């Protein structure tokens with residue numbers, strides 16, 4: 021039948037090792053260890069009548085899109101014709117019932133103390149409350165938190181290339197749009213591989229890693245389709261999403277709406293190009309590299325990224341960028 025107790029997904033040892041790693045209107049994301057293996061746990065309240073972080077809770081039906089999308093993107097690491105590891109593994113999904121575990125509140129508190137939270141402390145849920153718990157592969161640390169930690173603009177180039185490739189592969193296989201690819205949703209993890217591999221419509225290629233593997237996460241707003249069945253988040257009646265300021269990020273939401281005429285069911289892979297532009301913009305303006313571009317070779321990489329910034333909005337998809345933009349030649 022129905023939901024399982026929190027303790028089914030989060031036994032004592034696993035709860036004791038939880039550290040909060042991020043948040044959103046949806047809820048909370050923690051890192052922990054499951055079977056000696058780091059994982060990320062995303063916890064979303066469903067079906068209740070309380071306001072949570074300023075919104076009503078989703079119904080089970082309303083969470084299925086994100087579950088579906090998470091599974092599809094996870095599957096791309098093991099496909100053949102259109103293959104990428106540039107999203108994240110989905111290990112499990114559960115529906116749990118209970119009040120919020122005190123140990124997760126303790127982790128929540130530590131995060132609020134050190135980084136600050138925009139969320140309601142999740143301590144008001146009763147013992148009949150339902151949640152969806154998604155357990156993901158642990159993908160490393162977000163680009164925003166790594167903004168002063170990267171080696172050089174060659175590393176930035178790798179990151180852009182990886183992101184563009186991953187998005188292209190998902191466009192080709194799934195008519196995917198991420199739709200919220202701010203720099204908090206780009207993860208970086210060390211790899212000893214010198215080259216990373218992807219396959220796009222049957223053609224395989226490689227990207228120099230610069231020692232990092234990128235994972236694109238958080239599919240709250242994402243869209244895709246399969247066999248003409250579209251799965252998406254309909255934000256056509258959201259006001260607040262389109263009225264932010266203070267960062268180019270908030271312009272991207274408005275520019276998406278302009279591109280799609282507020283019809284979020286449609287496929288508009290230009291949204292992927294918009295997010296990639298926003299990300300290039302962050303690379304050129306808000307990162308501090310450990311090695312400056314004061315050699316001719318590194319200056320040259322900078323000029324290519326500036327050229328990418330200046331021209332990429334004339335491309336129609338991540339696929340168009342990957343296949344045709346001079347940056348990737």
Ligand SMILES: O=C1NCCCCCNc2ccn3ncc(c3n2)-c2cccc1c2
Nearest residue numbers: 041042043049060156157158159160237238
């Ligand atoms: O919805 C998700 N994230 C939204 C909040 C940002 C947390 C960003 N930081 C990290 C750090 C490491 N990891 N590893 C996996 C994930 C993850 N997230 C992850 C996976 C799927 C969704 C989200 C997050």
Ligand code: NA
Nearest residue numbers: 105106107235
């Ligand atoms: Na990944």
